[PDB]
Amino acid sequence: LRPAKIDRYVDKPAYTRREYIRGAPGPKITIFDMGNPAGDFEFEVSLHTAEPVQIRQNALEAARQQVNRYLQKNVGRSNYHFKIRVYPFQVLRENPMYGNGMRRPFGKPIGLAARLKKDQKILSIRVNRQHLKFAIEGARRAAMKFPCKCYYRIYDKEGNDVTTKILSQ
Amino acid sequence: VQKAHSFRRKTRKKLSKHPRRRGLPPLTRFLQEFEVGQRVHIVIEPSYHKGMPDPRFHGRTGTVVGKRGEAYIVEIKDGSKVKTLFIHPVHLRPQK
RNA sequence: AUAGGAGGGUGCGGCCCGAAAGGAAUGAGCCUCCCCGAAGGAAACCGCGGCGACGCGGGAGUACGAGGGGAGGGGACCGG
RNA sequence: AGGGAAACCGACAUGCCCGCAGCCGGGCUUAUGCCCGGUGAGGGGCGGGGUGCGAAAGCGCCCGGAGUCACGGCCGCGAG
RNA sequence: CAGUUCGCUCCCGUGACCCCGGGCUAGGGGUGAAAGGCCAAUCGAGGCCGGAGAUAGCUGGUUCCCGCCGAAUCAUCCCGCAGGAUGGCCUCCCCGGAGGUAGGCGGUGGGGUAGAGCACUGAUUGGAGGUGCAGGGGGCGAAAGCCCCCGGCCUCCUGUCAAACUCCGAACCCACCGCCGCCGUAGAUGGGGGGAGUAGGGUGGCGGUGUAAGCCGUCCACCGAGAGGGGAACAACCCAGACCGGGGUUAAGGCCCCAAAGUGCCGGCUAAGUGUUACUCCAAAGGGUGUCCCGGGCCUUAGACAGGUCGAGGUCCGGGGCCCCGAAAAUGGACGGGGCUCAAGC
RNA sequence: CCGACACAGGUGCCCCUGGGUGAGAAGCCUAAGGCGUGUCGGGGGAAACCCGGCCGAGGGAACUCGGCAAACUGGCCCCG
RNA sequence: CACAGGUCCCAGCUAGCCCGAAAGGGUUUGUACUGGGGCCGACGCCUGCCCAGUGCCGGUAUGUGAAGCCCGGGUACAACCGGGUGAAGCACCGGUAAACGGCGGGGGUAACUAUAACCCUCUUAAGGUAGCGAAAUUCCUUGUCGGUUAAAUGCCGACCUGCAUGAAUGGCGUAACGAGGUCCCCGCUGUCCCCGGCCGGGGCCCGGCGAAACCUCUGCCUGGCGCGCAUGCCAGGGACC
RNA sequence: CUCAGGCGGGUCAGGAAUCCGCCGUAGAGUGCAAGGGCAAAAGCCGGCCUGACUGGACCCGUAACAGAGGCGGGUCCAGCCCCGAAAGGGUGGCCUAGCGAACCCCUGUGCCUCCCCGGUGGGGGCCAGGGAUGACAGAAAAGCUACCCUGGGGAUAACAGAGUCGUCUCGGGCGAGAGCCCAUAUCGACCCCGAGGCUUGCUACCUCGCUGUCGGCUCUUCCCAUCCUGGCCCUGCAGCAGGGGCCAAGGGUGGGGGUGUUCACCCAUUAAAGGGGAACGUGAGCUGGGUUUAGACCGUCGUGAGACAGGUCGGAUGCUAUCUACCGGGGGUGUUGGCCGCCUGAGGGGAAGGUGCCCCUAGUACGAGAGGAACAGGGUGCCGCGGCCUCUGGUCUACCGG
RNA sequence: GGUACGGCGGCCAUAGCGGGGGGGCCACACCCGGUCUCAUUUCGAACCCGGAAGUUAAGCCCCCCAGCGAUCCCGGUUGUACUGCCCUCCGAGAGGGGGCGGGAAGCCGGGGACGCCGCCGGCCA
């Protein structure tokens, strides 16, 4: 597996038309909703990206697995809702290189990634007051697996930012 | 790979029509008249396939300098060359 | 014989040459004085503003200014 | 005197319109000069004409006289 | 010593042996126990002279001065790709006579890019409702059938997309008309003729491609084909476009010394020689009661914390500036150098 | 004589060789014959280093691609 | 490379093979125990299958097959068109492998587990026999086992899984021979541990004769810029001739 | 006249035979790819017909601006016609692909013409259609070169240099999990951020009027990401030893077997037997074993000449130092007159030293036991360096003897 | 001049889809019957020929709505997203920023919108 810095940046154009892309791989991440989606939770911790970034499906799956394990261990399946709000659409290609070099260098698909915009939410963990610390820790652990700087905010049901208010008292 | 220019080369959107404008256009544009020296814009009607100028000259403004049959003779200046075209009135619009 | 750059360019200073063809005793370098001067352009001092570096008005568009002219002294160099 | 593969046929010495320079007349302008109205060589455009294709229309080329010789120069082709 | 030699060592030395004189085989030919070997220091076709000054798109060279204007390496075609022709861009001469449009304002038309969005086409997490739907599998029943789920297909909610999607849609670009501006009767726009050179471009911004360097186009700004003043030197970066002799003021930028100009002024920050870098060169994720600040909070001046007693402010959170760790290379040494700490850094 | 030469090559080793040792026209010494012209001389603990030659304690191929080079044996008689 | 030996092919003479423009000629003052043309290469034991492919040889009934000749048309004569005859050569048939060259694959295989060995059948002519094998041939490879050494990408013997051995482009073996390549043992030694002395000739100085290769000008460094590795440029360091 | 699909209802008949009603902007269809256009149609079903024609103009595109043989398309005039009541439409396919110079030849159709005239056979010419060049703006066309030759190219490869670091080597963030519990004694998944230019690759920027390759020997020097030697921290550190980490580059890091080998493997010692840079340091220093000419053999491929980043045997290494560089040896000038002698020490160089073992401490501390230290104190070896010839050995072309 | 009358058109959804109430002087229709004109790939269903017994049930005409669709104005998101020219402005990079000039899309809230308009004629006056 090549370094993620090769695909971290969004200079290249969007490459997501499976009708014309030949051999595009299938997704490696298949679960995006976990916990109790229909539960009534007071607070929502959302993780935002600081820069326009491409997050590989491998990183998304790793963050999903670790955060879900931590939440199951420390919260309870019926006390949280962990959701990943972005699906990988961009197709990551690579130069398929006795042995020519840079001749016909158009790349073949090798993976998938999700492209995001500045200050865009990546994932959201809905929890009650008690489990806010665990939600924050899970968000931090997820952020530690991404190729860019990320921050987290706490919103109430309406959508007002109350992160400082809550974390202070 | 180099591609030569043809009549419909790269005209997916230029020669397309608004979805609500599908069908025959009103007959005023078809039956309009012009006078020598009048200046007219070249706006192609994709539905009518007769008397259509090359799409490369779509959107320009030319000078009427005569008439042949039901087509108007329109002169344009491409760079420094004078080009004469025979355009059906349905593909024309008066200036102002 | 304590000094660094393709061996030259700009400016001048030592040492040396300097009859002719270049100026010059019908005056050379040089010393003094007087007049007009384009663009530009101070300060002493007086009053005021600013926390301060400093600035504003007068002095003043004055002294000076590339160059263009004139007079006086000396008597052999200047250019090269 | 051109048109045509060939047989072969075979044309404006100005019918008309715009119009620069020049010329004429008028106004302003010290003058230069500018403006206006006519005539306008050369110039442009119509009209008409010869021939080739055609049943004809219509088109191509051409038609209201400038060429020729010489000295020198640039260039293209072939010869080293 | 020698355009093949000398020394030691080594092999044959009555045989297919070594040597001499007279003869024959001559160049696509001779001779060859076959190595393309030898044929007068020449052999995958000898030498001499003639064709012959052969030809080449390939390499090199092309001789006096000043004056005026001044390019190009991009489109089509070639057994074309180190070469040519037709165009484009340069220059010189002449005809024509009243206009022209690089810039701008307003108007009449064209557009589908950036952005955005799901109204089409194709993708996309979960939930709710509706449909027996060739789904399919089970309970149920000799059998025909029902009852369960799961799946398929529609509507809605929820969470996301598109270079080969668009219900929308700029900046902006182009054509034409009126005008301002500029050029033009000291003759433009335009037309005819003569002579070219140019068919490897580079840097820089943008677009496609690539791990990146790079490759391929586009923009015409700079070098090519460009002096002078600076960035330490530097093609391309900044000022600037230059006839000759003088005077002055400014531009880029600079003022502690090298080095002309301040150890200049006020407020704040840095303790790391961090820095002393406009760009050509410049290290990150992650962390820091290191400091200087801003904004929100909860307790809150004999009451808050540190250890029911003292008795002045505490305890968090999200941020901003500078700095710190993360940070290992080969000749001795690089902020240009010296050096610089209320600065000569920011 | 040929090779550009007063060339260590080739042509001509083409014809011949006293005494001793010895199988020998071998090696060494020597008589006759020839020469000091295989042509620049002189100096010197006057070095390092290079080329030719001799020896070298203990070990004996540990060197090296490889015992390259050198060393060991060496003639004659008898046995085997 | 040659060689003696083996074997194959053409030729009864005005032949076979060959030089040449021709005339004439070489083999030839020759005559099958001969002349000419290939391949292997003393000697010992042997040399298996295949004639579909290419080549060579013989036949060629039959098809095609040039000119010439004949017939009809055409031309006042020809040019021209159609048909008949039709050699060689090809098509066609057969021989020929010490001619060029080839000698696989599956269906399978069972009985003991592998093994599969005998063994039967089809694609096209046949499916590699005797021998030899990790080889001057073996990719994996420094194959595996044994010997040689303390230690073995070496050498020798064996195994067979022969990428890609093999019978006259010969297979296998072989005494004697070799300035051929290759491994080991005794002995020897300055090859080496580890180099040290000595001899003669140069080197060095002095007296003479006396050149050439080469040469943009010049000529100190560290870190940089640059066509990317500078004595000459930039900032520094050092340096008497 | 109106499609695809869907809904409700119908004998065989069900998912799908053939029907009936409703919804249905095209979700159908077009001769064919895609794009666009087409719903009282350009689609579906029917009637008639051949304009898929003849003689000609002007214009757009291929080929913007900006030149073009050939080709395609558009707007028209005339002729003779098709459909329709008429308007109106028809010069092929709804628009964009389905194709091609010169010369020569075949065909149609009318005319001109063939050397003094005329006739006949035959020939030539003008116009239209056709036979093809796919390398498609149009030569008719198989290979080896290692015996090669020539002219050039750093416009263009192999080694090296330069840029980059995908790969390579080496670090860091988080912490699921393994560790009796315990994430961090030790290992650390899935993910993410970096350093070096020590492997390989990519690019083609310098070098093809010449910069000699791998390996070994000789010799010099440098980096730390340290193998040992010096000093420390954590430990799942009792001692003896281990695992992880920090400071530290003064010194050492050796000898052998096969192989051309670097490397890797193996043997006996050792404290250790570290990885790298210097034009993959070092051929005007050496050697020439591997690699890469010319000779030859084997296997495989090719009809063949031949080829093989497949083996195998053989196969040349030029130098009189011009400048600078370093090693030592000399002659001058200057240092305010000259000369002899003795000193000072600014500076530069050094490793002048490095490292084992043995005896005691001690069979002690520690430990159930086995096993087993350290401080201090003594001895000595090896490597390196600088000197000497009394002793021992070599030589001793002085010398003596056989 | 009137008319809850018709024919031929213009812009071609702000005009459409879906709903509610009202009308029959003339006029427009539904509708009665198929000999003649015309037709069914059967059907007088359509098309066509001949008329008025009935009806305004609905096409048509007059008025009304805001459920869907469309679209105009205003306010908020917002001078946000994005962008032309210059830059010795910042950022390790990605990229951003300053000056002058342009400026959305979508969403939310309040209004608009159930079409305007032209020529002629019929009937009445």
mmCIF file of all heavy atoms in Angstrom, chain B residues 22-23 56 68 78 80-81 83-84, chain H residues 38 59 61-62 64 66-67 75:
data_model
loop_
_atom_site.group_PDB
_atom_site.id
_atom_site.type_symbol
_atom_site.label_atom_id
_atom_site.label_comp_id
_atom_site.label_asym_id
_atom_site.label_seq_id
_atom_site.Cartn_x
_atom_site.Cartn_y
_atom_site.Cartn_z
ATOM 1 N N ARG B 22 -39.019 22.060 -26.728
ATOM 2 C CA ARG B 22 -39.078 20.953 -27.670
ATOM 3 C C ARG B 22 -40.300 21.098 -28.567
ATOM 4 O O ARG B 22 -41.383 21.473 -28.110
ATOM 5 C CB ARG B 22 -39.132 19.622 -26.911
ATOM 6 C CG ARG B 22 -38.423 18.428 -27.567
ATOM 7 C CD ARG B 22 -36.988 18.731 -28.028
ATOM 8 N NE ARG B 22 -36.055 19.044 -26.948
ATOM 9 C CZ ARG B 22 -35.862 18.313 -25.857
ATOM 10 N NH1 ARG B 22 -36.400 17.113 -25.718
ATOM 11 N NH2 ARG B 22 -35.071 18.782 -24.894
ATOM 12 N N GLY B 23 -40.121 20.809 -29.848
ATOM 13 C CA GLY B 23 -41.185 20.913 -30.826
ATOM 14 C C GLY B 23 -40.923 22.021 -31.830
ATOM 15 O O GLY B 23 -39.822 22.568 -31.936
ATOM 16 N N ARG B 56 -19.987 26.791 -36.418
ATOM 17 C CA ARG B 56 -18.873 27.647 -36.031
ATOM 18 C C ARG B 56 -19.233 29.125 -36.103
ATOM 19 O O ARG B 56 -18.581 29.942 -35.447
ATOM 20 C CB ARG B 56 -17.661 27.367 -36.919
ATOM 21 C CG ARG B 56 -16.341 27.383 -36.170
ATOM 22 C CD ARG B 56 -15.200 27.867 -37.046
ATOM 23 N NE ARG B 56 -14.922 26.955 -38.149
ATOM 24 C CZ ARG B 56 -14.182 25.858 -38.047
ATOM 25 N NH1 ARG B 56 -13.648 25.487 -36.895
ATOM 26 N NH2 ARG B 56 -13.972 25.116 -39.129
ATOM 27 N N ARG B 68 -31.581 34.750 -52.096
ATOM 28 C CA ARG B 68 -31.664 33.705 -53.111
ATOM 29 C C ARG B 68 -32.694 32.690 -52.649
ATOM 30 O O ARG B 68 -32.569 32.137 -51.553
ATOM 31 C CB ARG B 68 -30.305 33.037 -53.335
ATOM 32 C CG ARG B 68 -30.273 32.077 -54.511
ATOM 33 C CD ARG B 68 -28.949 31.343 -54.584
ATOM 34 N NE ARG B 68 -27.826 32.256 -54.756
ATOM 35 C CZ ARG B 68 -26.596 31.882 -55.080
ATOM 36 N NH1 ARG B 68 -26.288 30.610 -55.275
ATOM 37 N NH2 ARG B 68 -25.650 32.807 -55.213
ATOM 38 N N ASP B 78 -14.712 37.048 -40.706
ATOM 39 C CA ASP B 78 -13.949 36.113 -39.882
ATOM 40 C C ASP B 78 -12.484 36.515 -39.978
ATOM 41 O O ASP B 78 -11.827 36.276 -40.993
ATOM 42 C CB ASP B 78 -14.169 34.677 -40.344
ATOM 43 C CG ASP B 78 -14.263 33.701 -39.186
ATOM 44 O OD1 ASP B 78 -14.989 33.994 -38.214
ATOM 45 O OD2 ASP B 78 -13.611 32.638 -39.250
ATOM 46 N N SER B 80 -9.991 38.691 -41.092
ATOM 47 C CA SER B 80 -9.975 39.705 -42.139
ATOM 48 C C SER B 80 -10.604 39.207 -43.435
ATOM 49 O O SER B 80 -10.572 39.925 -44.441
ATOM 50 C CB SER B 80 -8.542 40.175 -42.402
ATOM 51 O OG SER B 80 -7.687 39.079 -42.670
ATOM 52 N N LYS B 81 -11.171 38.004 -43.440
ATOM 53 C CA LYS B 81 -11.799 37.435 -44.624
ATOM 54 C C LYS B 81 -13.304 37.651 -44.577
ATOM 55 O O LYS B 81 -13.931 37.504 -43.524
ATOM 56 C CB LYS B 81 -11.499 35.939 -44.739
ATOM 57 C CG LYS B 81 -10.146 35.620 -45.344
ATOM 58 C CD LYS B 81 -9.942 34.120 -45.496
ATOM 59 C CE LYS B 81 -10.766 33.554 -46.642
ATOM 60 N NZ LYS B 81 -10.476 32.114 -46.882
ATOM 61 N N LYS B 83 -16.838 36.306 -45.478
ATOM 62 C CA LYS B 83 -17.466 35.016 -45.722
ATOM 63 C C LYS B 83 -18.947 35.224 -45.995
ATOM 64 O O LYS B 83 -19.640 35.896 -45.219
ATOM 65 C CB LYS B 83 -17.260 34.074 -44.533
ATOM 66 C CG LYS B 83 -15.796 33.755 -44.274
ATOM 67 C CD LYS B 83 -15.613 32.590 -43.317
ATOM 68 C CE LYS B 83 -14.156 32.157 -43.267
ATOM 69 N NZ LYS B 83 -13.897 31.132 -42.222
ATOM 70 N N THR B 84 -19.422 34.651 -47.096
ATOM 71 C CA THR B 84 -20.812 34.750 -47.517
ATOM 72 C C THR B 84 -21.525 33.444 -47.200
ATOM 73 O O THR B 84 -21.030 32.365 -47.542
ATOM 74 C CB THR B 84 -20.905 35.049 -49.014
ATOM 75 O OG1 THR B 84 -20.211 36.268 -49.308
ATOM 76 C CG2 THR B 84 -22.355 35.177 -49.451
ATOM 77 P P C H 38 -37.364 18.726 -31.445
ATOM 78 O OP1 C H 38 -38.061 19.959 -31.008
ATOM 79 O OP2 C H 38 -37.387 17.519 -30.587
ATOM 80 O "O5'" C H 38 -37.946 18.295 -32.860
ATOM 81 C "C5'" C H 38 -39.256 17.770 -32.957
ATOM 82 C "C4'" C H 38 -39.309 16.548 -33.838
ATOM 83 O "O4'" C H 38 -38.045 15.838 -33.803
ATOM 84 C "C3'" C H 38 -40.331 15.502 -33.433
ATOM 85 O "O3'" C H 38 -41.643 15.840 -33.842
ATOM 86 C "C2'" C H 38 -39.782 14.236 -34.079
ATOM 87 O "O2'" C H 38 -40.112 14.180 -35.458
ATOM 88 C "C1'" C H 38 -38.273 14.449 -33.933
ATOM 89 N N1 C H 38 -37.720 13.761 -32.744
ATOM 90 C C2 C H 38 -37.645 12.363 -32.734
ATOM 91 O O2 C H 38 -38.055 11.722 -33.713
ATOM 92 N N3 C H 38 -37.140 11.733 -31.650
ATOM 93 C C4 C H 38 -36.707 12.446 -30.610
ATOM 94 N N4 C H 38 -36.214 11.783 -29.562
ATOM 95 C C5 C H 38 -36.765 13.868 -30.593
ATOM 96 C C6 C H 38 -37.271 14.479 -31.672
ATOM 97 P P C H 59 -18.348 32.285 -54.887
ATOM 98 O OP1 C H 59 -17.576 33.522 -54.615
ATOM 99 O OP2 C H 59 -17.734 31.204 -55.698
ATOM 100 O "O5'" C H 59 -18.802 31.669 -53.490
ATOM 101 C "C5'" C H 59 -19.459 32.479 -52.528
ATOM 102 C "C4'" C H 59 -20.221 31.658 -51.516
ATOM 103 O "O4'" C H 59 -21.089 30.709 -52.188
ATOM 104 C "C3'" C H 59 -19.392 30.790 -50.584
ATOM 105 O "O3'" C H 59 -18.808 31.520 -49.519
ATOM 106 C "C2'" C H 59 -20.404 29.751 -50.122
ATOM 107 O "O2'" C H 59 -21.238 30.266 -49.094
ATOM 108 C "C1'" C H 59 -21.243 29.556 -51.387
ATOM 109 N N1 C H 59 -20.837 28.358 -52.159
ATOM 110 C C2 C H 59 -21.059 27.106 -51.580
ATOM 111 O O2 C H 59 -21.570 27.076 -50.451
ATOM 112 N N3 C H 59 -20.708 25.987 -52.250
ATOM 113 C C4 C H 59 -20.161 26.087 -53.463
ATOM 114 N N4 C H 59 -19.829 24.959 -54.095
ATOM 115 C C5 C H 59 -19.928 27.350 -54.081
ATOM 116 C C6 C H 59 -20.278 28.450 -53.402
ATOM 117 P P G H 61 -15.505 28.002 -44.094
ATOM 118 O OP1 G H 61 -15.003 28.563 -42.815
ATOM 119 O OP2 G H 61 -14.779 28.286 -45.356
ATOM 120 O "O5'" G H 61 -15.603 26.420 -43.934
ATOM 121 C "C5'" G H 61 -16.233 25.836 -42.802
ATOM 122 C "C4'" G H 61 -16.142 24.331 -42.829
ATOM 123 O "O4'" G H 61 -16.819 23.819 -44.002
ATOM 124 C "C3'" G H 61 -14.741 23.744 -42.923
ATOM 125 O "O3'" G H 61 -14.092 23.682 -41.665
ATOM 126 C "C2'" G H 61 -14.988 22.372 -43.539
ATOM 127 O "O2'" G H 61 -15.397 21.437 -42.553
ATOM 128 C "C1'" G H 61 -16.174 22.650 -44.462
ATOM 129 N N9 G H 61 -15.799 22.838 -45.877
ATOM 130 C C8 G H 61 -15.711 24.025 -46.557
ATOM 131 N N7 G H 61 -15.390 23.876 -47.812
ATOM 132 C C5 G H 61 -15.270 22.503 -47.975
ATOM 133 C C6 G H 61 -14.938 21.739 -49.123
ATOM 134 O O6 G H 61 -14.679 22.141 -50.262
ATOM 135 N N1 G H 61 -14.927 20.375 -48.851
ATOM 136 C C2 G H 61 -15.200 19.817 -47.627
ATOM 137 N N2 G H 61 -15.142 18.482 -47.538
ATOM 138 N N3 G H 61 -15.507 20.520 -46.549
ATOM 139 C C4 G H 61 -15.524 21.847 -46.791
ATOM 140 P P U H 62 -12.502 23.485 -41.580
ATOM 141 O OP1 U H 62 -12.130 23.385 -40.149
ATOM 142 O OP2 U H 62 -11.877 24.526 -42.430
ATOM 143 O "O5'" U H 62 -12.241 22.070 -42.266
ATOM 144 C "C5'" U H 62 -12.499 20.854 -41.577
ATOM 145 C "C4'" U H 62 -12.067 19.663 -42.394
ATOM 146 O "O4'" U H 62 -12.763 19.678 -43.664
ATOM 147 C "C3'" U H 62 -10.591 19.620 -42.764
ATOM 148 O "O3'" U H 62 -9.799 19.032 -41.747
ATOM 149 C "C2'" U H 62 -10.578 18.825 -44.066
ATOM 150 O "O2'" U H 62 -10.564 17.427 -43.814
ATOM 151 C "C1'" U H 62 -11.920 19.203 -44.690
ATOM 152 N N1 U H 62 -11.815 20.254 -45.728
ATOM 153 C C2 U H 62 -11.697 19.850 -47.041
ATOM 154 O O2 U H 62 -11.654 18.679 -47.371
ATOM 155 N N3 U H 62 -11.628 20.866 -47.956
ATOM 156 C C4 U H 62 -11.667 22.219 -47.698
ATOM 157 O O4 U H 62 -11.592 23.013 -48.634
ATOM 158 C C5 U H 62 -11.798 22.562 -46.315
ATOM 159 C C6 U H 62 -11.870 21.587 -45.404
ATOM 160 P P A H 64 -7.982 25.985 -40.538
ATOM 161 O OP1 A H 64 -6.605 26.492 -40.754
ATOM 162 O OP2 A H 64 -8.256 25.069 -39.404
ATOM 163 O "O5'" A H 64 -8.953 27.238 -40.397
ATOM 164 C "C5'" A H 64 -10.334 27.136 -40.710
ATOM 165 C "C4'" A H 64 -11.115 28.246 -40.058
ATOM 166 O "O4'" A H 64 -11.161 28.026 -38.628
ATOM 167 C "C3'" A H 64 -10.518 29.636 -40.213
ATOM 168 O "O3'" A H 64 -10.902 30.251 -41.429
ATOM 169 C "C2'" A H 64 -11.021 30.372 -38.978
ATOM 170 O "O2'" A H 64 -12.334 30.873 -39.177
ATOM 171 C "C1'" A H 64 -11.075 29.252 -37.942
ATOM 172 N N9 A H 64 -9.904 29.199 -37.046
ATOM 173 C C8 A H 64 -8.889 28.275 -37.071
ATOM 174 N N7 A H 64 -7.995 28.440 -36.129
ATOM 175 C C5 A H 64 -8.460 29.538 -35.425
ATOM 176 C C6 A H 64 -7.957 30.216 -34.303
ATOM 177 N N6 A H 64 -6.831 29.873 -33.673
ATOM 178 N N1 A H 64 -8.660 31.274 -33.845
ATOM 179 C C2 A H 64 -9.788 31.616 -34.477
ATOM 180 N N3 A H 64 -10.361 31.058 -35.540
ATOM 181 C C4 A H 64 -9.639 30.011 -35.971
ATOM 182 P P A H 66 -6.960 35.994 -42.112
ATOM 183 O OP1 A H 66 -5.631 36.130 -41.465
ATOM 184 O OP2 A H 66 -7.496 37.105 -42.934
ATOM 185 O "O5'" A H 66 -6.933 34.689 -43.025
ATOM 186 C "C5'" A H 66 -6.361 34.727 -44.328
ATOM 187 C "C4'" A H 66 -5.686 33.425 -44.686
ATOM 188 O "O4'" A H 66 -4.517 33.245 -43.840
ATOM 189 C "C3'" A H 66 -6.542 32.177 -44.494
ATOM 190 O "O3'" A H 66 -6.194 31.203 -45.478
ATOM 191 C "C2'" A H 66 -6.115 31.689 -43.114
ATOM 192 O "O2'" A H 66 -6.342 30.316 -42.877
ATOM 193 C "C1'" A H 66 -4.628 32.026 -43.129
ATOM 194 N N9 A H 66 -4.034 32.205 -41.803
ATOM 195 C C8 A H 66 -4.319 33.164 -40.865
ATOM 196 N N7 A H 66 -3.604 33.061 -39.771
ATOM 197 C C5 A H 66 -2.791 31.963 -40.009
ATOM 198 C C6 A H 66 -1.803 31.331 -39.235
ATOM 199 N N6 A H 66 -1.451 31.730 -38.013
ATOM 200 N N1 A H 66 -1.182 30.259 -39.768
ATOM 201 C C2 A H 66 -1.534 29.855 -40.995
ATOM 202 N N3 A H 66 -2.444 30.366 -41.818
ATOM 203 C C4 A H 66 -3.043 31.430 -41.258
ATOM 204 P P G H 67 -7.201 30.868 -46.683
ATOM 205 O OP1 G H 67 -7.845 32.134 -47.113
ATOM 206 O OP2 G H 67 -8.041 29.715 -46.278
ATOM 207 O "O5'" G H 67 -6.239 30.392 -47.860
ATOM 208 C "C5'" G H 67 -5.580 31.335 -48.690
ATOM 209 C "C4'" G H 67 -4.383 30.724 -49.372
ATOM 210 O "O4'" G H 67 -3.350 30.455 -48.398
ATOM 211 C "C3'" G H 67 -4.621 29.385 -50.051
ATOM 212 O "O3'" G H 67 -5.162 29.535 -51.352
ATOM 213 C "C2'" G H 67 -3.238 28.736 -50.049
ATOM 214 O "O2'" G H 67 -2.490 29.116 -51.194
ATOM 215 C "C1'" G H 67 -2.585 29.345 -48.803
ATOM 216 N N9 G H 67 -2.424 28.415 -47.665
ATOM 217 C C8 G H 67 -2.572 28.759 -46.343
ATOM 218 N N7 G H 67 -2.331 27.781 -45.518
ATOM 219 C C5 G H 67 -1.978 26.724 -46.341
ATOM 220 C C6 G H 67 -1.609 25.396 -46.006
ATOM 221 O O6 G H 67 -1.519 24.881 -44.886
ATOM 222 N N1 G H 67 -1.327 24.642 -47.136
ATOM 223 C C2 G H 67 -1.393 25.105 -48.425
ATOM 224 N N2 G H 67 -1.086 24.218 -49.382
ATOM 225 N N3 G H 67 -1.736 26.341 -48.753
ATOM 226 C C4 G H 67 -2.013 27.097 -47.669
ATOM 227 P P U H 75 -30.550 23.932 -48.541
ATOM 228 O OP1 U H 75 -31.714 24.213 -47.665
ATOM 229 O OP2 U H 75 -30.619 22.824 -49.526
ATOM 230 O "O5'" U H 75 -30.193 25.268 -49.331
ATOM 231 C "C5'" U H 75 -30.262 26.536 -48.695
ATOM 232 C "C4'" U H 75 -30.129 27.655 -49.696
ATOM 233 O "O4'" U H 75 -28.783 27.677 -50.237
ATOM 234 C "C3'" U H 75 -31.018 27.547 -50.922
ATOM 235 O "O3'" U H 75 -32.340 27.997 -50.686
ATOM 236 C "C2'" U H 75 -30.263 28.369 -51.958
ATOM 237 O "O2'" U H 75 -30.486 29.759 -51.775
ATOM 238 C "C1'" U H 75 -28.814 28.052 -51.598
ATOM 239 N N1 U H 75 -28.262 26.937 -52.399
ATOM 240 C C2 U H 75 -27.576 27.234 -53.560
ATOM 241 O O2 U H 75 -27.412 28.373 -53.956
ATOM 242 N N3 U H 75 -27.086 26.146 -54.240
ATOM 243 C C4 U H 75 -27.215 24.821 -53.874
ATOM 244 O O4 U H 75 -26.726 23.936 -54.576
ATOM 245 C C5 U H 75 -27.937 24.596 -52.661
ATOM 246 C C6 U H 75 -28.421 25.639 -51.984
#
